[PDB]
Amino acid sequence: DHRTSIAQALVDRIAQQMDGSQPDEYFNNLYGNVSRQTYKFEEIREFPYVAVHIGTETGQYLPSGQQWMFLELPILVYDKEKTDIQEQLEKLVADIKTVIDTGGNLEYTVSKPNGSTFPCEATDMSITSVSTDEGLLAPYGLAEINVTVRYQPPRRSLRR
């Protein structure tokens, strides 16, 4: 299953769209401060920063070899005051929600034990909820995002 490759693909999509080519479209540039494997808060030395975490993956079988799988991505957006922090977080969440809900379905490249990588696409992908920090620390603040994805694997049991 494609849990890491999907997280990688979404990280790539965030970096590509945020980068600066959409200046009247996204409030920010991240300069590559979005990542999958460097996410513990001690690790972060720049702000803003976007950390992608991988949730539980679940499955659902269907009558003749098909199956759905569902993934959660908890996303954390860490930021530091310059303006009031709740307005900055509102900007970053608006940007990342736009990047979620616009453009095509998320493509990811499934690397294979034969050495190939097969280009595939997540069928449906949906942000569900947002929350924000109480504001006790300053200047640091945080917003949670919960993302859900549904995708279908290769049709394993009938290819075999």
Binding site: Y31, F41, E46, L76, L137
Partner: protein
């Protein structure tokens, strides 16, 4: 004295933002001065020192062991000449004559470290991080994660202090 500048911290952190915030750059500028001072060095070039002297005693210790050359010495405002003494490492002067009792006045240039050792450069980076992340706390629990911080000593975080003490003069 500069132990680090912006490029050194940028290498250590791996920062790819195009510039530092004024916070980090001020913290770097303070960190240089503080580590300069906790070692007991100072950034003066030429130093003047007044020493009590007695005829029984002919080893004298300069105030800063990085002293590189004596450039005047005099006793009771009677000047004496470079054949009458020898200057050894760690700022030790050995008189070749037993001195008249009273005050000795000496000028010397104090030099410093060269090159700055990589362990000081690291300790400076860790101090800048310490102030920048505001890790002068005993615990935090933002969200679900949780950490407990070092048992700091002399108010300096314990994992920094070993590197200072390996060099702390006197």
């Amino acid at each position: 004295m500069q132990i680090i500048t912006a490029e050194d911290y940028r290498l250590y952190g791996g920062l790819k933002r195009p510039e530092l915030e004024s916070g980090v750059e001020m913290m770097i500028t303070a960190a240089n001065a503080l580590i300069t001072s906790l070692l007991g060095m100072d950034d003066a070039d030429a130093v003047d020192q007044l020493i009590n002297t007695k005829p029984t005693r002919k080893k004298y210790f300069l105030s800063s062991p990085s002293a590189t050359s004596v450039t005047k010495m005099t006793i009771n405002d009677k000047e004496i000449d470079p054949e009458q003494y020898k200057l050894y490492s760690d700022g030790v002067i050995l008189l070749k004559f037993s001195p008249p009792e009273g005050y000795m006045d000496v000028e010397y240039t104090q030099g410093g470290f060269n090159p700055i050792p990589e362990d000081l450069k690291l300790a400076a980076c860790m101090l800048v991080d310490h102030w920048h992340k505001q890790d002068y706390r005993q615990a935090k629990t933002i969200g679900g994660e949780t950490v407990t911080f070092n048992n700091t000593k002399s108010g300096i975080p314990e994992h920094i202090r070993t590197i200072i003490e390996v060099y702390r003069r006197v």
